Design an enzyme around this catalytic site. Sequence first.
Site, PDB file in Angstrom:
ATOM      1  N   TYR A   1       0.872  -1.197   0.000  1.00  0.00           N
ATOM      2  CA  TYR A   1       0.000   0.000   0.000  1.00  0.00           C
ATOM      3  C   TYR A   1       0.888   1.219   0.000  1.00  0.00           C
ATOM      4  O   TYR A   1       1.588   1.455   0.983  1.00  0.00           O
ATOM      5  CB  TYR A   1      -0.965   0.046   1.131  1.00  0.00           C
ATOM      6  CG  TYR A   1      -2.004   1.083   0.938  1.00  0.00           C
ATOM      7  CD1 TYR A   1      -3.182   0.816   0.239  1.00  0.00           C
ATOM      8  CD2 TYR A   1      -1.860   2.353   1.441  1.00  0.00           C
ATOM      9  CE1 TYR A   1      -4.167   1.767   0.035  1.00  0.00           C
ATOM     10  CE2 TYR A   1      -2.798   3.312   1.175  1.00  0.00           C
ATOM     11  CZ  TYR A   1      -3.955   3.050   0.433  1.00  0.00           C
ATOM     12  OH  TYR A   1      -4.976   3.994   0.174  1.00  0.00           O
TER      13      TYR A   1
ATOM     14  N   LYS B   1       3.420   4.244   7.601  1.00  0.00           N
ATOM     15  CA  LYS B   1       2.669   3.535   8.667  1.00  0.00           C
ATOM     16  C   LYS B   1       3.510   3.282   9.881  1.00  0.00           C
ATOM     17  O   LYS B   1       2.974   3.525  10.967  1.00  0.00           O
ATOM     18  CB  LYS B   1       2.165   2.224   8.139  1.00  0.00           C
ATOM     19  CG  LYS B   1       1.413   1.305   9.167  1.00  0.00           C
ATOM     20  CD  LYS B   1       0.040   1.725   9.574  1.00  0.00           C
ATOM     21  CE  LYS B   1      -0.845   1.803   8.405  1.00  0.00           C
ATOM     22  NZ  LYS B   1      -2.300   1.925   8.819  1.00  0.00           N
TER      23      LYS B   1
ATOM     24  N   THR C   1      -0.009  23.847  -3.893  1.00  0.00           N
ATOM     25  CA  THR C   1       0.130  25.223  -3.273  1.00  0.00           C
ATOM     26  C   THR C   1       0.290  25.246  -1.808  1.00  0.00           C
ATOM     27  O   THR C   1       1.083  26.093  -1.333  1.00  0.00           O
ATOM     28  CB  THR C   1      -1.060  26.051  -3.766  1.00  0.00           C
ATOM     29  OG1 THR C   1      -1.154  26.083  -5.176  1.00  0.00           O
ATOM     30  CG2 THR C   1      -1.026  27.476  -3.290  1.00  0.00           C
TER      31      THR C   1
HETATM   32  C1  LIG Z   1      -3.978  26.019  -7.464  1.00  0.00           C
HETATM   33  C2  LIG Z   1      -4.833  25.562  -8.535  1.00  0.00           C
HETATM   34  C3  LIG Z   1      -5.014  24.116  -8.724  1.00  0.00           C
HETATM   35  C4  LIG Z   1      -4.176  23.179  -7.949  1.00  0.00           C
HETATM   36  O1  LIG Z   1      -4.255  23.253  -6.518  1.00  0.00           O
HETATM   37  P1  LIG Z   1      -3.004  22.762  -5.650  1.00  0.00           P
HETATM   38  O2  LIG Z   1      -3.457  23.100  -4.236  1.00  0.00           O
HETATM   39  O3  LIG Z   1      -1.780  23.559  -6.093  1.00  0.00           O
HETATM   40  O4  LIG Z   1      -2.830  21.278  -5.914  1.00  0.00           O
HETATM   41  C5  LIG Z   1      -5.986  23.627  -9.548  1.00  0.00           C
HETATM   42  N1  LIG Z   1      -6.709  24.471 -10.336  1.00  0.00           N
HETATM   43  C6  LIG Z   1      -6.547  25.792 -10.332  1.00  0.00           C
HETATM   44  C7  LIG Z   1      -7.362  26.658 -11.225  1.00  0.00           C
HETATM   45  C8  LIG Z   1      -5.610  26.369  -9.402  1.00  0.00           C
HETATM   46  O5  LIG Z   1      -5.450  27.697  -9.326  1.00  0.00           O
HETATM   47  C1  LIG Z   2      -1.189   5.526   4.758  1.00  0.00           C
HETATM   48  C2  LIG Z   2      -0.119   4.921   3.999  1.00  0.00           C
HETATM   49  C3  LIG Z   2       0.237   5.502   2.697  1.00  0.00           C
HETATM   50  C4  LIG Z   2      -0.624   6.552   2.118  1.00  0.00           C
HETATM   51  O1  LIG Z   2      -0.803   7.754   2.884  1.00  0.00           O
HETATM   52  P1  LIG Z   2      -2.130   8.620   2.661  1.00  0.00           P
HETATM   53  O2  LIG Z   2      -1.967   9.711   3.710  1.00  0.00           O
HETATM   54  O3  LIG Z   2      -3.332   7.715   2.921  1.00  0.00           O
HETATM   55  O4  LIG Z   2      -2.105   9.118   1.229  1.00  0.00           O
HETATM   56  C5  LIG Z   2       1.382   5.137   2.050  1.00  0.00           C
HETATM   57  N1  LIG Z   2       2.142   4.110   2.522  1.00  0.00           N
HETATM   58  C6  LIG Z   2       1.849   3.435   3.631  1.00  0.00           C
HETATM   59  C7  LIG Z   2       2.716   2.316   4.088  1.00  0.00           C
HETATM   60  C8  LIG Z   2       0.712   3.850   4.411  1.00  0.00           C
HETATM   61  O5  LIG Z   2       0.408   3.234   5.561  1.00  0.00           O
HETATM   62  N1  LIG Z   3      -0.560  29.123 -10.955  1.00  0.00           N
HETATM   63  C1  LIG Z   3      -0.700  27.872 -10.162  1.00  0.00           C
HETATM   64  C2  LIG Z   3       0.488  26.953 -10.425  1.00  0.00           C
HETATM   65  C3  LIG Z   3       1.747  27.480  -9.748  1.00  0.00           C
HETATM   66  C4  LIG Z   3       2.000  26.761  -8.429  1.00  0.00           C
HETATM   67  C5  LIG Z   3       0.997  27.195  -7.368  1.00  0.00           C
HETATM   68  N2  LIG Z   3      -0.362  27.201  -7.875  1.00  0.00           N
HETATM   69  C6  LIG Z   3      -0.795  28.156  -8.693  1.00  0.00           C
HETATM   70  O1  LIG Z   3      -1.248  29.216  -8.296  1.00  0.00           O
HETATM   71  N1  LIG Z   4      -4.243   0.625   5.153  1.00  0.00           N
HETATM   72  C1  LIG Z   4      -4.118   1.947   4.483  1.00  0.00           C
HETATM   73  C2  LIG Z   4      -5.143   2.062   3.360  1.00  0.00           C
HETATM   74  C3  LIG Z   4      -6.547   2.253   3.920  1.00  0.00           C
HETATM   75  C4  LIG Z   4      -6.952   3.722   3.892  1.00  0.00           C
HETATM   76  C5  LIG Z   4      -6.197   4.517   4.949  1.00  0.00           C
HETATM   77  N2  LIG Z   4      -4.779   4.216   4.947  1.00  0.00           N
HETATM   78  C6  LIG Z   4      -4.309   3.078   5.450  1.00  0.00           C
HETATM   79  O1  LIG Z   4      -4.041   2.933   6.631  1.00  0.00           O
END
Ligand SMILES: *Cc1c(COP(=O)(O)O)cnc(C)c1O
Ligand SMILES: *Cc1c(COP(=O)(O)O)cnc(C)c1O
Ligand SMILES: N[C@H]1CCCCNC1=O
Ligand SMILES: N[C@H]1CCCCNC1=O
Lengths: 423, 423
Positions: free
Chosen positions: B134, B229, B283
Amino acid sequence: GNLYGRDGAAIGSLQKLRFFPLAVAGGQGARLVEEDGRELIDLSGAWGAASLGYGHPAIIEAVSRAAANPAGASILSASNAPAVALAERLTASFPRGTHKVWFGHSGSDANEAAYRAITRATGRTGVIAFIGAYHGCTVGSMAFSKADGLILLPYPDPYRPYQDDPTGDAVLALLKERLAAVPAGSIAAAFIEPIQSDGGLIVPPDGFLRKFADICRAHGISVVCDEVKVGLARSGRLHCFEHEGFVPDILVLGKGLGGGLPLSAVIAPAEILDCASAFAMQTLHGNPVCAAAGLAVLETIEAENLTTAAERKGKLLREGLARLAERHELIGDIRGRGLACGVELVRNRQSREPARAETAKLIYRAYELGLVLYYVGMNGNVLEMTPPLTMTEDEVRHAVNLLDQAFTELTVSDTLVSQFAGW
Amino acid sequence: GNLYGRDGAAIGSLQKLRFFPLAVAGGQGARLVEEDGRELIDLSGAWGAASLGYGHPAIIEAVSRAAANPAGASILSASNAPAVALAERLTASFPRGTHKVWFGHSGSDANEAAYRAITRATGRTGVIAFIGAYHGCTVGSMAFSKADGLILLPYPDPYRPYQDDPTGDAVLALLKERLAAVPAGSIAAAFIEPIQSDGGLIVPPDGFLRKFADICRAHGISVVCDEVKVGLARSGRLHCFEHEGFVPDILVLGKGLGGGLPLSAVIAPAEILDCASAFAMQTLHGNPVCAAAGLAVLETIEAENLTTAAERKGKLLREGLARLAERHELIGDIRGRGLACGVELVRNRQSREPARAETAKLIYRAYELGLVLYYVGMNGNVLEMTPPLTMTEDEVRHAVNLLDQAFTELTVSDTLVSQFAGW
Ligand SMILES: *Cc1c(COP(=O)(O)O)cnc(C)c1O
Ligand SMILES: *Cc1c(COP(=O)(O)O)cnc(C)c1O
Ligand SMILES: N[C@H]1CCCCNC1=O
Ligand SMILES: N[C@H]1CCCCNC1=O
């Protein structure tokens, strides 16, 4: 050593997008404080994330409260009260009984989840998006920002019309061409920004988006409105699509939703978000600290009348900038809605030739003078202004005044600027 | 209506992984409080995210402080003091001058960024991972949890040895077979969990991981250790690889790093994280509220001697469980390190046949009795225990006591259980 040099030593470049050596130690109101104690007015509002600026009392209150008595840490394997209250508030804000919410950490994870959900609900992979669109920076959100069946259209720009058609009708015709050449029903979704952000704060021509949505609806294609940048009061209406005479099927929110904490949301038909379980999930999604912050942002928008504030203060800002244009010839176009404003810089007003190099020095000088703003655009020549919705009128005026100094004192070595990658 | 029914009405199923109708309104210490005021002991520690439990003073302090004077909202286009201080603390904890940090929101975004960075640094797409691993729930982290050049190996399980080789050497031989059949140098990275989480809290055989890492190093393949984890004191050492006689090239952290706030990190050679800029970015990455929480977690691990606590309290928990095994025959195996413990339930001790159905009722009954825990495993038959590192000894004993009641009172209708998808 100084904070900026420690940042180079300790944090990889992989996620950096730096324009000048901004090194922040604190924040208050719409101002950032650098390690040395120097204050800057933040016209960038942290790319739009700092909807209530820095240390707003509603954020303090909410996050402090939730940190001391958090309803767990997640929505995955537990319901939690803050997350459900936020989901109900968000659906109540969106045109009843049809939509549900999914919570994420970012605009990238939200646009990815919206895309995976609609492809799973429909069994179709194809997708419409726009050249220059910014939907995030993860493999699943970059797929359409590649997906099989991706159709990329030019975003219609009043300042640079496609096929010399100011209306955008030529773009609509192009869509229909592209749809005619693939099977009926092969397109799952259309992703749109109701003001194109990195494309250069482009407000589309009147009527375009509604006609676009009508085409999509005629083909059974879900219309996803990405309001991560220009949503939640920034445009002078709560939702930016309210300016545009259509309602999307799906709304994507992020950035200022969290007030400086990581929070995103997809508002989508129930059938789209209920088509699978345990399908798009991250453990801290829906955690109650960030949900509390979101609730604080929505409550503040109501309590502090920030939709109207954004409209009023945007007009002030754009008026200030048109006074600057009377003396600074580099300014070609001033555009946007509310407190999403773009200022396009051109070498000449008649040819509209982009002014890339001057724009990067301009913002560097602004930084030296105490003003934070960044540039966007395919040609790196549009100043973006997305300040905190709580920025005061006087701060708006101090920022225009510092900008006037930066356009005038335009001083920054071509060597000094070249030290920052930016884009 | 009740909170759980409001959760069904308002939040899509897309991100839900529900086992029983846990509906949380608050939290304190290692206990959750439901809407009706009922308290439960949280042996799940929010899947490991609630490293300091709920309302720990260090979290309150840090997040309240940062919310009132935040150093902006991001690491992308600004350096910030909390993020850089956290990056330096994390690198100082990892075996100097070679590694940098990238910050994310989640284990999914971190494993995705690690994979994109190593593929960009090397120009190779191939990747080794394990069946049942995972690594997250996004398109880019699911690619190896598909990537061209994906090699998937069985994780060696002492309780179910592959090819009846308890050492895991047969798995190593299989790797070499798989590598021999593709070009030298086509594999970028190997992703490993030093205790396999969803695979069933599997501690590999002695020496396996070091021999695995030696193979990878002989082929120039970067060894990425996903400690989302079982990292950060949970195992009874700070980093779980410390039990295993090797040092990985890259360390992935998440979950309990944030103490209930969304925070992840990749610690990687500088050349890997400096091979691109503006490349893997969101961001709110590196926002100072979540960085402050991370710093609080690391500081608390030191101040409250939580590495030793996890070792000591894990031994207590596993001893408690072995007393339960003297009377509850369903218990087949008790395993793990520190406060990452798995209890494998089997229909018969001799055949080791998995007990899926009983495990899902068991946890439902536990919930009815005031104890939260979930199941994992390819066969849905391993109880996972990852409580807050600050869980008291008496709470450990109350939880084993409630578990004893649940194994005994094993009452829950096959209809009631079928109402929850779980996995
Ligand atoms: C910032 C932005 C995203 C992405 O958000 P993140 O928090 O950077 O992943 C997506 N769409 C638009 C129009 C944005 O300005
Ligand atoms: C939870 C978990 C992830 C993923 O983290 P998220 O915060 O759910 O995206 C990745 N690797 C391991 C081993 C985990 O337990
Ligand atoms: N203009 C977008 C992509 C640049 C990185 C941060 N996010 C934004 O505002
Ligand atoms: N066992 C993993 C995947 C389930 C969703 C949340 N994250 C975890 O702990």
